[PDB]
């Protein structure tokens with residue numbers, strides 16, 4: 001994964017935008033750096049990870065699960081995370 005990935009400018013689809021609005025200000029275009037941070041903040045604040053197994057996010061009982069299409073995932077699975085995120089946005093140039 002290149003460092004340039006974080007510079008990608010994106011327009012969230014409605015479900016992603018809904019989630020983002022619960023953790024950050026509503027603007028039209030976000031960087032991937034922004035999207036990752038806000039989704040990360042969402043996971044941390046809502047305690048969707050378990051303190052006894054801190055790499056795994058459980059989202060079966062959360063909007064995030066609908067966003068990503070999985071009951072759980074590992075925060076270490078970066079390629080997978082980017083794919084899950086990408087399906088919820090449009091890239092802009």
Ligand SMILES: COc1ncc(-c2nc3c(n2C(C)C)[C@H](c2ccc(Cl)cc2)N(c2cc(Cl)cn(C)c2=O)C3=O)c(OC)n1
Nearest residue numbers: 036037039040041043044049054055057075076078081082
């Ligand atoms: C409890 O302590 C504890 N500490 C730390 C983490 C944690 N590790 C990581 C993350 N976090 C949180 C901000 C969620 C964060 C992340 C952000 C958004 C999502 Cl959708 C999923 C994970 N991420 C990254 C993934 C990618 Cl693809 C790129 N980049 C740049 C990352 O940084 C990680 O590698 C964590 O996760 C539960 N829990």
Ligand SMILES: [Cl-]
Nearest residue numbers: 061062063064
């Ligand atoms: Cl929810």
